[PDB]
Design a protein around this motif. Structure first.
Motif, mmCIF file in Angstrom:
data_model
loop_
_atom_site.group_PDB
_atom_site.id
_atom_site.type_symbol
_atom_site.label_atom_id
_atom_site.label_comp_id
_atom_site.label_asym_id
_atom_site.label_seq_id
_atom_site.Cartn_x
_atom_site.Cartn_y
_atom_site.Cartn_z
ATOM 1 N N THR A 45 18.631 18.402 -22.637
ATOM 2 C CA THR A 45 20.067 18.583 -22.756
ATOM 3 C C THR A 45 20.666 18.959 -21.280
ATOM 4 N N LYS A 46 19.947 19.365 -20.527
ATOM 5 C CA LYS A 46 20.350 19.527 -19.098
ATOM 6 C C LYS A 46 19.391 19.169 -18.273
ATOM 7 N N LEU A 47 19.701 19.136 -16.896
ATOM 8 C CA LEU A 47 18.623 19.132 -15.748
ATOM 9 C C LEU A 47 18.012 20.406 -15.618
ATOM 10 N N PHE A 48 16.678 20.160 -14.995
ATOM 11 C CA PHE A 48 15.713 20.920 -14.524
ATOM 12 C C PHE A 48 16.088 21.570 -13.106
ATOM 13 N N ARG A 49 16.646 22.725 -13.029
ATOM 14 C CA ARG A 49 16.773 23.290 -11.627
ATOM 15 C C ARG A 49 16.306 24.469 -11.501
ATOM 16 N N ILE A 50 15.802 24.615 -10.160
ATOM 17 C CA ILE A 50 15.279 25.852 -9.594
ATOM 18 C C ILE A 50 16.229 26.411 -8.629
ATOM 19 N N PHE A 51 16.684 25.864 -7.794
ATOM 20 C CA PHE A 51 17.628 26.263 -6.618
ATOM 21 C C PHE A 51 18.920 25.979 -7.060
ATOM 22 N N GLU A 52 20.023 26.719 -6.048
ATOM 23 C CA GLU A 52 21.365 26.582 -6.170
ATOM 24 C C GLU A 52 22.028 26.969 -5.052
ATOM 25 N N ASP A 110 24.246 10.908 -22.722
ATOM 26 C CA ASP A 110 24.884 12.001 -23.388
ATOM 27 C C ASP A 110 25.032 13.341 -22.487
ATOM 28 N N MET A 111 24.669 13.126 -21.193
ATOM 29 C CA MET A 111 24.769 14.260 -20.268
ATOM 30 C C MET A 111 25.637 13.789 -19.173
ATOM 31 N N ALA A 112 27.072 13.610 -19.185
ATOM 32 C CA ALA A 112 27.761 13.223 -18.323
ATOM 33 C C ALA A 112 29.152 14.203 -18.278
ATOM 34 N N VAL A 113 29.551 14.995 -17.373
ATOM 35 C CA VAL A 113 30.650 15.484 -17.253
ATOM 36 C C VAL A 113 31.670 14.821 -16.323
ATOM 37 N N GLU A 114 32.851 14.555 -16.443
ATOM 38 C CA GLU A 114 33.857 13.808 -15.621
ATOM 39 C C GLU A 114 34.203 14.578 -14.373
ATOM 40 N N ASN A 115 34.060 13.666 -13.211
ATOM 41 C CA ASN A 115 34.265 14.407 -12.038
ATOM 42 C C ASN A 115 35.889 14.350 -11.922
ATOM 43 N N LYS A 116 36.497 15.238 -11.858
ATOM 44 C CA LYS A 116 37.966 15.552 -11.794
ATOM 45 C C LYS A 116 38.753 15.499 -10.345
ATOM 46 N N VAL A 124 29.856 12.507 -13.135
ATOM 47 C CA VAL A 124 28.630 13.158 -12.602
ATOM 48 C C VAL A 124 27.524 13.421 -13.814
ATOM 49 N N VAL A 125 26.208 13.799 -13.239
ATOM 50 C CA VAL A 125 25.387 13.906 -14.249
ATOM 51 C C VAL A 125 25.259 15.184 -15.031
ATOM 52 N N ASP A 126 25.721 16.214 -14.537
ATOM 53 C CA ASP A 126 25.505 17.403 -15.254
ATOM 54 C C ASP A 126 26.905 18.269 -14.839
ATOM 55 N N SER A 127 27.090 19.628 -15.786
ATOM 56 C CA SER A 127 27.769 20.289 -15.316
ATOM 57 C C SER A 127 27.955 21.074 -14.114
ATOM 58 N N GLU A 128 26.569 21.524 -13.791
ATOM 59 C CA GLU A 128 26.492 21.882 -12.324
ATOM 60 C C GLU A 128 26.648 21.076 -11.212
ATOM 61 N N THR A 129 26.487 19.786 -11.518
ATOM 62 C CA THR A 129 26.718 18.688 -10.571
ATOM 63 C C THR A 129 28.237 18.679 -10.121
ATOM 64 N N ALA A 130 29.262 18.956 -11.246
ATOM 65 C CA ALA A 130 30.631 18.877 -10.970
ATOM 66 C C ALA A 130 30.822 20.156 -10.442
ATOM 67 N N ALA A 131 30.156 21.394 -10.537
ATOM 68 C CA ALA A 131 30.640 22.521 -10.117
ATOM 69 C C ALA A 131 30.410 22.623 -8.803
ATOM 70 N N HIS A 175 14.622 17.180 -7.179
ATOM 71 C CA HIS A 175 14.624 15.785 -7.177
ATOM 72 C C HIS A 175 13.295 15.100 -7.632
ATOM 73 N N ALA A 176 12.291 15.768 -7.069
ATOM 74 C CA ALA A 176 11.032 15.566 -7.343
ATOM 75 C C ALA A 176 10.580 15.600 -8.609
ATOM 76 N N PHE A 177 11.158 16.852 -9.095
ATOM 77 C CA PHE A 177 11.026 17.216 -10.511
ATOM 78 C C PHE A 177 11.899 16.268 -11.522
ATOM 79 N N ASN A 178 12.639 16.124 -11.669
ATOM 80 C CA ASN A 178 13.547 15.331 -12.328
ATOM 81 C C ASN A 178 13.200 13.945 -12.074
ATOM 82 N N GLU A 179 12.745 13.174 -11.228
ATOM 83 C CA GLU A 179 12.341 11.902 -11.112
ATOM 84 C C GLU A 179 11.056 11.749 -11.927
ATOM 85 N N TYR A 180 10.164 12.712 -12.119
ATOM 86 C CA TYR A 180 8.955 12.562 -12.813
ATOM 87 C C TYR A 180 9.165 12.372 -14.238
ATOM 88 N N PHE A 181 10.009 13.024 -14.874
ATOM 89 C CA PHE A 181 10.272 13.066 -16.185
ATOM 90 C C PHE A 181 11.070 11.773 -16.400
#
Lengths: 805, 49, 49
Positions: A45-52, A110-116, A124-131, A175-181
């Motif tokens: 449902t959401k992207l895999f993130r380690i860093f912020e 099904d995982m896309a929040v609009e860029n305001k 954009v592709v996630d809620s954190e990506t727009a954040a 980026h290397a983790f999300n590309e492999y899935f």
């Protein structure tokens, strides 16, 4: 006396059963196979993130706080443990977590929040990506080439070619983790040529079962292939107790599938006729009312199910008979000429072959009683195959000596197949000729009353020729058409426990069968397939998960990790074993063979993607520091951009390293006490915590060098906490560093790192995935199958089975 | 107190391993020897040491 | 004196047994019909009228 002989017998059979991991309610295992779910499809449902990204204050060269802040890459959830063994055990728990988080397929629409902030319709592709994107636009510190771009950035969706790409903001580790899935999917396209190939070839090329496909599959229909390759752990050569469970558990499933007989001969008319031909009252027989006890309608269906299901799963099968009762011994002649000789345990095949010769065959031809020694390579049907001088009897003894299973490999799997002469039913035409001539023989010493009753018990089976050829054409067809849906390998060894077959109830089958043929229903035949694929694909998805942890625990150098606890969790998820009865001899052979296998390809590129970055996640954490270096001389504090005045170390060069992980295992404190009791420079290496004390008077009082004396007083090294000076503007008593003429110095310093900054041009990229899938779980719900009318059922040759009509 | 989780053969053997490890006067050569004290399981021929 | 490094020994045995106290509980014997009971010469006993 029978209560003393049986309680002594049943206390030795219990010692053997406590080393077999089968369950004591035998019929309880049938629920445990029919409930194994195939797999789980996992959409993320959401992207895999380690860093912020975060904002941290940035100071000047001298200690003045600067207004403009900068964006650093400090990670979220920095709950790293203490000590180099507890850190390297944490990363195994990360690798064990990612393997369950890993998706089979990852859609992106099904995982896309609009860029305001976009002029046109941007997404954009996630809620954190727009954040992160709205935090960069409104902040004035960013360059205008970045501010115009996040409004002008735009996705590209193409519904005709079924692709879509979306922008992102991600760390290079994510980026290397999300590309492999996203590049290595598991779903494969599906059409009507794959469902017609997933069905077996022996049923697809059959005449009775008609198979039509009545549902339309769309162009965007995908499916997940079952992993059906053979057992890399050869569980049938040296695991004599772990194979008896798999052979029992595959025998109880195959008894619930084989159909039960219908329209038998009436059991009150056969026994009333069978008691007239034998004339048991006029003889000298102790068991007068005991010859006809096992003839029943519920015991003819048992020896039709026991004889097939102990032949599909290669299960040994002992014999139980009474050598007084000669009618249960004549029906043992039909059992040996059809069922192959390597199926029965040898001590019960010799004890039946000897009782047939020494009572019926050798008293007929007038020969001496056969003196047989039990330590002999030759079975008694191989000795009397040469010493007998007939031809009808010496040719039936040649077939029963030379019928076994002929191994053959059909469509990938090995399967033990009967010879062409039994499936044709033609052998019973030879047994009739070997049993009719044995009925004409004068028994030259037998009393006339007992001879005339053993000649009429033979003619109750020689006169049933037409409905006994018609049995073995069906007994070899139900086994042949159920063997098509066997996905696992049909290996053949001798088990420990045997399913007892009673020769009293084989008599209840040879003279109670009728002309009513039964074939397996296509809904039954498709359910015995889907249980076998769901268990065999589960057997290969636990081996690949128990190897990928045993191997990954050895690469990370994890001692004091009990590998036996992983094999007990591998045997547990195989849903037919229990662990409390497996011997300890076969839990160290199962660990010896699980290490030699190679790791699966998709579970290795995740572990190689962690081991490459295991030092970048460990160093980027707060509340941890990779060692303290003691100098015992004056050294000036260098100025940093996020700590102000600080004592950090960039390299452990020149100074002797002592590993604090090895110092805890051994306990040899003779060197590090001798380095500390004198004044010799040293560098401790480990994963230590620290305290961050900004007090300037805590530097003039030299509070850094006093924390190491606890190593000398008490032998524990866990209570090591070096100090880390962070002299800023916000720290009071700062007026000493500014006004007075002195440089700040500290005797020791600490090994630490600085987090990576936020560069926009290397943090964004476009993720390209598909638009819409449809993943189907079962495939034989599309094939609509019907059978032929059961009267017109045909064998491998087109002459019909059960042709007495 | 070993390098890896091993098994000594008696409860009296482990009692005089802990009594020498936790002293304040035991030299470091003996304290390094108790850490290197584990078992060896062979499964081809079923023997243990 | 007690020297630690020279007083240890590496004891060895098997992993798993399964001992059995009665052997004639596994075999199960029966007898041929007593009219056809045969003496040391291969003619039967009690055959005359």
């Amino acid at each position: 006396l029978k209560t003393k002989e049986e309680h002594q017998k049943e206390v030795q059979y219990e010692i053997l059963q406590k080393t077999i991991p089968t369950f004591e309610p035998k019929e309880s295992i049938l629920k445990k196979l029919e409930d194994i779910k195939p797999e789980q499809v996992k959409k993320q449902t959401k992207l895999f993130r380690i860093f912020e990204p975060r904002q941290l204050p940035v100071y000047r060269a001298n200690g003045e706080k600067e207004l403009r802040n900068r964006w650093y890459w400090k990670l979220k959830r920095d709950t790293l443990p203490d000590g180099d063994y507890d850190v390297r055990e944490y990363f195994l728990n990360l690798y064990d977590q990612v393997l369950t988080e890993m998706p089979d397929y990852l859609l992106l629409k099904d995982m896309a929040v609009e860029n305001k902030n976009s002029r046109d319709a941007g997404k954009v592709v996630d809620s954190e990506t727009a954040a992160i994107c709205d935090a960069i636009f409104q902040d004035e510190e960013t360059e205008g080439v970045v501010r115009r771009f996040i409004a002008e950035m735009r996705q590209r969706v193409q519904a005709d070619r079924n692709v879509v790409n979306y922008p992102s903001i991600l760390h290079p580790i994510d980026h290397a983790f999300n590309e492999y899935f996203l590049q290595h999917q598991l779903v494969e396209p599906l059409n009507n040529d794959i469902i017609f190939n997933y069905i077996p070839e022996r049923i697809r090329n059959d005449v009775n079962y008609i198979l039509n496909m009545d549902r339309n599959l769309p162009s965007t229909a995908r499916y997940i292939r079952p992993n059906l390759l053979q057992d890399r752990l050869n569980l049938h050569d040296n695991f004599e107790s772990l194979w008896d469970t798999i052979t029992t558990s595959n025998y109880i499933l195959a008894r619930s599938v084989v159909p039960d007989l219908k329209e038998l001969v009436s059991t009150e008319a056969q026994i009333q006729k069978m008691s007239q031909d034998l004339q048991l009252e006029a003889l000298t027989i102790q068991s007068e009312t005991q010859f006809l006890t096992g003839i029943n309608s519920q015991a003819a269906n048992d020896c039709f199910k026991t004889l097939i299901a102990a032949m599909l799963s290669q299960r040994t099968m002992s014999l139980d008979f009474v050598t007084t009762n000669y009618m249960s011994l004549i029906s043992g002649m039909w059992l040996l000429t059809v069922v192959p000789n390597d199926m029965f345990i040898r001590e019960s095949l010799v004890a039946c072959q000897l009782a047939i010769i020494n009572t019926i065959i050798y008293p007929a031809f007038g020969m001496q009683r056969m003196h047989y020694r039990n330590g002999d390579p030759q079975t008694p049907f191989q000795i009397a195959e040469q010493q007998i001088q007939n031809f009808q009897v010496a040719n039936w003894l040649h077939f029963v000596n030379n019928n076994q299973f002929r191994q053959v490999v059909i469509d990938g799997v090995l399967n033990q197949v009967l010879n062409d002469n039994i499936r044709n039913g033609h052998v019973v035409n030879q047994l009739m000729e070997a049993l009719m001539q044995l009925s004409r023989q004068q028994f030259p010493t037998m009393p006339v009353d007992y001879k005339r009753s053993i000649q009429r018990g033979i003619l109750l089976l020689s006169n049933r020729l037409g409905q006994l050829v018609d049995l073995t054409r069906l007994l070899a067809y139900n086994y042949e058409t159920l063997m098509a849906c066997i996905t696992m390998n049909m290996q053949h060894v001798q088990t420990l426990t045997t399913e007892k077959l009673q020769l009293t109830s084989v008599t209840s089958l040879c003279m109670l069968i009728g002309n009513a043929t039964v074939i397996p229903s296509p809904q039954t035949l498709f359910h015995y397939y889907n249980v076998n694929v769901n268990f065999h694909s589960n057997y290969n998805e636990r081996i690949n998960d128990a190897v990928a942890i045993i191997t990954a625990a050895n690469r990370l150098n994890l001692y004091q990790k009990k590998m036996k606890s992983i094999v007990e969790d591998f045997l547990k998820r195989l849903q037919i074993f229990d662990i409390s009865r497996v011997p300890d001899d076969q839990m160290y052979r199962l660990r010896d063979r699980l290490r030699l296998l190679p790791v699966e390809i998709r579970r290795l590129d995740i572990f190689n993607l962690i081991l490459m970055n295991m030092e970048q996640i460990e160093r980027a954490s707060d509340k941890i520091a990779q060692g303290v270096i003691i100098a015992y001389r004056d050294m000036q504090l260098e100025r940093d951009e996020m700590y102000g005045y600080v004592n950090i170390a960039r390299n452990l060069d020149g100074f002797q390293q002592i590993n604090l992980e090895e110092l805890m295992r051994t306990g040899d404190y003779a060197q590090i006490t001798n380095m500390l009791l004198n004044n010799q420079p040293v560098a401790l290496v480990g994963a230590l915590p620290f305290i961050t004390d900004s007090s300037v008077i805590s530097l003039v009082a030299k509070l850094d060098a006093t924390v190491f004396a606890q190593i000398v007083k008490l032998r524990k090294v866990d209570t090591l906490k070096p100090i880390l000076y962070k002299i800023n503007s916000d720290s009071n008593d700062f007026y000493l560093v500014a006004n007075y003429d002195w440089v700040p110095t500290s005797t020791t310093k600490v090994y630490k790192q600085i987090p990576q900054q936020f560069d926009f041009r290397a943090s964004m990229h476009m993720l390209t995935s598909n638009l819409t899938f449809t993943v189907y779980s079962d495939l034989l719900a599309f094939v609509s199958a019907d059978t032929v009318e059961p009267i017109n059922a045909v064998a491998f040759d087109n002459m019909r089975i059960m042709n007495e009509l």
